[PDB]
Design a protein around this ligand. Structure first.
Ligand code: HEM
Length: 385
């Protein structure tokens, strides 16, 4: 089964936590301390993925996640200015408003898809609003986003060509859309991320307009699918372990902790990419500059040295030092937003439909990916009828 890569991770942690894969041409790292070192050692393991000159120079390609220090620190210090607990005080009620708008549109249905009707849309709508995208543009904004992260319908040759073109169209349309917004918010600010990024300064430096376009597009990519899966996956866990659901209803203040345990147990992001910057040894393995490394946080999260009874879902787990948000200088700067978006949507669902259970029409349909762990649909019956 493809909703279970954890058997394979165990087999690999127990034989060769660091191993070369000859087909994929990468060093896999399955063991907690190894994943930890790959992400912490910025200077050994590089996040530089900027496209060569002969490839398309997208604003995303040189955005925060694809660069190293010293530039990464300059850029990080600036975008961090828009992700403070102070901005969150304004984001929360927008997120509750959107959560209730979405539940209201399916109030009339006994069975609902957690993915299509609630978790897929919620991040897209939130991030539009907090970016400063006006309401009159938000349907076109959802369309662009559906397209830039879509997969192909079938494996036919023409439909793959079509997708590849419509994605480049969307990236370049989005970029022009964002370039306009930046000018509009240049002379008429507002309380939105873009306006904040425009006014930010650090040691007398500022973000260019390209950098801001790139980071905006980045937030779309980084925060949409992942947050969707954190919610879907959390429902899935509670429907699997009814005991934990029942306990969660009786102790509401456990929810943040049970979300953290979904982050550990069914991590939206199973792995990352790094490139070796200098020869290094790792669990006795000689890694040579230029070779590619894939730390699997999903496996690290099942290492008993750091998580007792790792194969058990424990909504009160303590300690729970997952790296679902990475670790080190590239640590997810949206983790606070992902956490409250999951919390608000999931609290409301639990409050309204405590007898919730699998739709008898349910199907296990996992995303066809190894780096991304989540469901295409998650059919649920409310049992309020
Ligand atoms: C459950 C939800 C999420 C998960 C599991 C997740 C996962 C991650 C991980 C693992 C990293 C480290 C990447 C690396 O080192 O290559 C990362 C970075 C990042 N994330 Fe998140 N993410 C989530 C939600 C979000 C949201 C909601 C946003 C923004 C709205 C966001 C924006 C970013 C950005 C901009 C970075 C790059 C930071 C840097 O390279 O300095 N993510 N994310």
């Amino acid at each position: 089964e493809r909703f279970n890569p954890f058997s394979w991770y165990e087999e690999m942690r127990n034989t060769a936590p660091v191993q070369w894969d000859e087909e994929r041409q990468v060093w896999d790292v399955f063991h907690y301390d190894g994943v930890k070192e790959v992400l912490e050692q910025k200077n050994i393991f590089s996040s530089d993925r900027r496209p060569p000159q002969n490839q398309r120079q997208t604003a995303l390609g040189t955005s925060l996640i694809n660069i190293d220090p010293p530039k990464h620190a300059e850029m990080r210090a600036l975008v961090n200015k828009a992700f403070t607990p102070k901005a969150m005080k304004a984001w929360e009620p927008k997120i509750a408003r959107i959560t209730n708008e979405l539940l209201q549109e399916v109030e009339h249905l006994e069975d609902i898809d957690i993915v299509e009707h609630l978790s897929y849309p919620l991040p897209v709508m939130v991030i539009a609003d907090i970016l400063g995208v006006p309401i009159e543009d938000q349907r076109q904004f959802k369309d662009w986003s559906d397209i830039i992260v879509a997969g192909p319908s079938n494996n036919e040759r023409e439909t793959l060509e079509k997708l590849q073109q419509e994605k480049m169209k969307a990236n370049d349309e989005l970029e022009t859309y964002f370039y306009r917004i930046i000018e509009e918010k240049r002379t008429r600010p507002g309380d939105d991320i873009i306006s904040v990024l425009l006014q930010a300064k650090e040691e007398g430096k500022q973000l260019t307009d390209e950098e801001i376009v790139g980071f905006s597009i980045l937030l779309l990519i980084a925060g949409n699918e992942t947050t969707t899966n954190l919610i879907s996956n959390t429902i899935y866990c509670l429907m699997e372990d009814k005991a934990s659901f029942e306990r969660l209803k009786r102790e509401k203040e456990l929810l943040p902790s049970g979300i953290e345990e979904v982050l550990r147990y069914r991590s939206p992001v199973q792995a990352l990419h790094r490139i070796v910057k200098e020869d290094v040894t790792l669990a006795g393995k000689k890694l040579k500059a230029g070779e590619h490394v894939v730390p699997w946080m999903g496996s690290a999260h099942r290492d008993a040295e750091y998580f007792e009874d790792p194969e058990v879902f424990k909504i009160d787990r303590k300690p729970n030092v997952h790296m679902a948000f990475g670790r080190g200088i590239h640590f997810c700067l949206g983790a606070p937003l992902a956490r409250i978006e999951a919390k608000i949507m999931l609290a409301e669902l639990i409050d309204r439909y405590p007898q919730m259970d699998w739709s008898p029409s349910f199907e296990l349909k996992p995303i066809e990916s190894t780096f991304v762990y989540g469901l295409k649909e998650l059919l649920i019956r409310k049992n309020v009828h």
